[PDB]
Amino acid sequence: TPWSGYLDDVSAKFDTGVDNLQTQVTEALDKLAAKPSDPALLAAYQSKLSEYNLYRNAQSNTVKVFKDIDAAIIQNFR
Amino acid sequence: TPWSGYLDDVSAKFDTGVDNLQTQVTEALDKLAAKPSDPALLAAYQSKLSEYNLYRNAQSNTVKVFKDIDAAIIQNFR
Amino acid sequence: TPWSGYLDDVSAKFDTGVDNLQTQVTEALDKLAAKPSDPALLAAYQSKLSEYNLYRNAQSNTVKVFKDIDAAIIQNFR
Amino acid sequence: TPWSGYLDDVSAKFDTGVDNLQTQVTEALDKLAAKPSDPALLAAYQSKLSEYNLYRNAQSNTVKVFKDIDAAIIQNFR
Amino acid sequence: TPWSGYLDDVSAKFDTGVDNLQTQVTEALDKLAAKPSDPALLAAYQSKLSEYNLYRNAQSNTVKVFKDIDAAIIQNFR
Amino acid sequence: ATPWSGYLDDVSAKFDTGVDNLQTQVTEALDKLAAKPSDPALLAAYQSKLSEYNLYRNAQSNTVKVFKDIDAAIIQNFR
Amino acid sequence: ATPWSGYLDDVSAKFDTGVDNLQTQVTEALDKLAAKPSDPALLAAYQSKLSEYNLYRNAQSNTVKVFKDIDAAIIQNFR
Amino acid sequence: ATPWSGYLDDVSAKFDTGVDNLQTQVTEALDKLAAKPSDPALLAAYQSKLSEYNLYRNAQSNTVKVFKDIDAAIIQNFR
Amino acid sequence: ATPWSGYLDDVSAKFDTGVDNLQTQVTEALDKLAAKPSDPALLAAYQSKLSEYNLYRNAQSNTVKVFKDIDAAIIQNFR
Amino acid sequence: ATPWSGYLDDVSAKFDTGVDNLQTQVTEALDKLAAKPSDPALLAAYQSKLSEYNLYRNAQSNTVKVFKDIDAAIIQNFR
Amino acid sequence: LWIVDLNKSDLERLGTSWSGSITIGDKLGVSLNQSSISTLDGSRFIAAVNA
Amino acid sequence: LWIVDLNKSDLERLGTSWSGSITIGDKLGVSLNQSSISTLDGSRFIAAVNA
């Protein structure tokens, strides 16, 4: 049923390496939406949202580099 | 006519190596198109689309190299 | 009714995916321009515009990828 | 009717396959030239023109492969 | 073997001269088909398939050369 | 002696034994980085490593193609 | 075996060994400043250290990237 | 006597003997700058040196490739 | 007895003895680049050596066939 | 003493005496460009000269081969 | 024409293998039954079991 | 026709290998059993063990 390649494996390593951020960022937003003027919740959500921004940025570039390295080999088969 | 030469076999091996990718690639497309602005769907699609690209490229180059091996033998029959 | 290709199908999938966003943007810009200084209208308009941008951008990059996979296969018919 | 060869039949199968693309692609241009800065127009023209490109390349490559099969058989009548 | 001419002896020298390449390439194909995006599997298959190509070419040209030498000698019995 | 090998296999193995352990170094430094994606030391390491792995596989595949071309050019002249 | 290293990671290491201790100093300063955030002696110090570390990392990454591009441009011409 | 060198060798070496000392100047400046990364007089020097080195290595490899093609086209016609 | 060698052998061997050491230079430069695949100096050297080697083997194999085709043409007229 | 020249020699000589000076212009261009590779005035000229040289050599070779095959085809009919 | 084929087979694998690495004092690496560099600079052991 | 094959084998491997690098000030360094000095402070050694 499921099928997974090397590139999606490389993504999965990130998904498993950030154990819970996927949920923490969702919750901290709800808390802040409840009372936006609390500087505690503000500092928390700033921390989380920056961590999420980096996690996604690095994930995509890694995948893209491993695509290019494969294309450059398959080009030489002929 | 279930007739399948050696080249057909060589190609079929890839089709049966990537069991479900053929449809996963469309499932991901449909759910992305339902809500284009979601990071989880974007990150999933990228990793599937790239795998499908490299799949079709290796598939076609292998076929061509085998054809060029056969033709050089058949030429020597004279 | 008129002939449509595979790249047409893949394009139209987005047009049908974001069901009304083209209309919603055409409306929100009119009601904004009718009173440019209501912050509720500004806050409404910002989302629709950002959504439209990401929509059209994903739409075109997908098409270009599927084009180049096919040009890569066709190159080996020789 | 005028005389038509086997390569003509093969060629014409494509033209009659893509019933209307031949003209859709021109109308799209005539419209887009009217307002070159309409993204709804651009998104359509990109698709039509990509389809046209793939159509013409598949056509020519097929014709050539059959020319080289026939030439190879005719060579051995001697 | 029931019967083997000089040309067969020549061909068999190549076959017995390459130990197991016949199967090595076969196995490498299935491995790569399982993970078409692993660089290691790609770099392995490129090598095996190149080696196989050269093996078949060298094999087939020699047999022809030896055929022409014999045909030339046989002609002069007349 | 080894299961079998042509001259091209040898040219490949010369790279694979020239970069002594880069394959595992890269395979693990990722497992570090993924667990704490936001540490600048870890990033600068992974950048430096993946650039090496890129160039390695690139030059590896090009050399094989050049030797295959040189052999085909001679075998063609027998006939 | 010695831990294998290439060219690019040795140019990378040149900076790490150029800045003898900045890596630790940057933490020490943060530690003492966090202990007493309103002390202006500490603030100007931490400002200095952090402004240093930022240029250190930037110049490092950029130099590595240029030395990658120079190699890829040559390796392409082997074909 | 001296290691055998062909036409392409004697073309490539022309560049090396053209840029008399650049190969050293680049490493010199690199070390001086790594000693004190935040110094504008060093940065403004190393930018120039590295740009020169890039252009040199690039134009060298392109010219050697063109002179390979000119020869192969002639050799093919012998047969 | 001394190994018999003909006219085509003679013509072929002139190239081998004409290129004094190329045949080994291209092996050393490979072992080096393989030891450090990411140094531009080693790349710029190997590009040259591998080009010269490719051209040598092509010119050799074409010239031998051109001679073989003259001898085979003359022997046909003895009849 | 002076070389015997055939007909193909005359054909080749027409090109050699056609490009009066290019043979040396190319070399001078290279010498100065290699002396100062980063000057676009030098580069813009060398690009032209090198391209003219490539076309000249290519046309010369292709022409000679055609005459060879016409002669060979006539000679064959003597038998 | 009667053709008959019969087969029996019995198989058994059981036990363990080991390898690992330590580091002492930033003086000494030690590695046991690894061809690795012991790259971690910290103690690792790895058992392998099959039954 | 009776065809019989019989086979026995024993092997054993045991012991240690050593190499390292030592540095005295900047100006001096020594490499033991290794092509080059580790550009490293103090000393380092490795004791590969096979059993």
DSSP A10-72: HHHHHHHHSSSHHHHHHHHHHHHHH-TT-HHHHHHHHHHHHHHHHHHHHHHHHHHHHHHHHHH
G1 and K37 in contact by Cβ < 8 A? yes
Nearby residues of K48 by Cβ (< 8 Å), 6 or more positions away: K16, K17, K18
Name the resolution in angstroms. Answer: 3.3
Let me know: does F55 contact A68? Beta carbons within 8 Å: no
Let me know: does B51 contact B21? Beta carbons within 8 Å: yes
CA–CA separation, C17 vs C22, rounded Å? 11
In the complex, which subunits touch F with 3 or more CB pairs below 8 angstroms? A, E, G, I, K
Please report where in the chains the tokens 């000076």 appear, as a residue.
J21
State whether residue F6 sits within 8 Å of chain E by CB: yes
Helices (H) and strands (E) in chain D, counts: 3, 0
Tokens representing H12? 């490539």
Count interface pairs A-B at CB distance under 8 A.
44
Helix, strand, coil abundance in chain D, percent, nearest 5: 85, 0, 15
Q: Which residue of B has its CA nearest to C21?
A: B35
CA–CA separation, A19 vs J55, rounded Å? 64
H77 and J62 in contact by Cβ < 8 A? yes
DSSP secondary structure letters along chain I:
-PPP--HHHHHHHHHHHHSSSHHHHHHHHHHHHHHSTT-HHHHHHHHHHHHHHHHHHHHHHHHHHHHHHHHHHHHGGG-
Helix, strand, coil abundance in chain L, percent, nearest 5: 0, 45, 55
Count interface pairs A-F at CB distance under 8 A.
39
In this structure, how many other beta carbons lie within 10 angstroms of the beta carbon of residue J49?
A: 17
Q: Is G52 exposed, middle or buried, given 0-12, 13-18 or 19+ CB atoms closer than 10 A?
A: middle
User: Are there at least 3 beta-carbon pairs closer than 8 Å between D and K?
Assistant: no
CA–CA separation, C6 vs D50, rounded Å? 11
Which residues face K17 on adjacent strands?
A: K48
- Helix boundaries (H) for chain H: 7-18, 22-35, 40-76
Q: Report which of K30, F21, K37, K28 is spatially closest to residue L16, judged by C-alpha positions.
A: K30
- Chain C residue numbers touching B52 (CB-CB < 8 A): 69
Let me know: does F64 contact G21? Beta carbons within 8 Å: no
In this structure, how many other beta carbons lie within 10 angstroms of the beta carbon of residue I38?
A: 24
User: Are there at least 3 beta-carbon pairs closer than 8 Å between I and H?
Assistant: yes
* Structure determined via: cryo-EM
User: Which amino acid is present at B6?
Assistant: Y
State whether residue L38 sits within 8 Å of chain G by CB: yes
Tokens representing E54? 């050269």
Please report where in the chains the tokens 């030690």 appear, as a residue.
K30
Q: How far is CA G76 from CA E47, G71, K24, in A?
A: 19, 9, 45
Q: Which of 2-61 (G) contact K at CB < 8 A?
A: 2-4
Let me know: does A76 contact F65? Beta carbons within 8 Å: yes
I36 and G77 in contact by Cβ < 8 A? no
B53 and C76 in contact by Cβ < 8 A? no
- Chain A residue numbers touching E51 (CB-CB < 8 A): none
Give buried/exposed letters for E15-35 (b at 16+ CB in 10 A, else e): eeeeeebeebbeebbeebbeb
Q: Report which of F19, G1, K42 is spatially closest to residue L46, judged by C-alpha positions.
A: G1
Which residues face K16 on adjacent strands?
A: K49
CA–CA separation, B10 vs B70, rounded Å? 14
Q: Report which of F33, L8, F69 is spatially closest to residue E57, judged by C-alpha positions.
A: F69
Which residues face K47 on adjacent strands?
A: K18
Nearby residues of B53 by Cβ (< 8 Å), 6 or more positions away: A67, C65, C69
Q: Report which of C25, C27, C78 is spatially closest to residue C55, judged by C-alpha positions.
A: C25
H58 and G70 in contact by Cβ < 8 A? yes
Tokens representing D39? 């993204």
Q: What is the DSSP letter of E37?
A: T
Coil/strand/helix, residue A1: coil
I52 and H8 in contact by Cβ < 8 A? yes
Tokens representing J31? 């010498």
Residue C19 C-beta-side C-alpha neighbours within 13 Å: 1
CA–CA separation, I3 vs I11, rounded Å? 16
| Alpha carbon of H35: minimum distance to chain J alpha carbons (Å) | 28
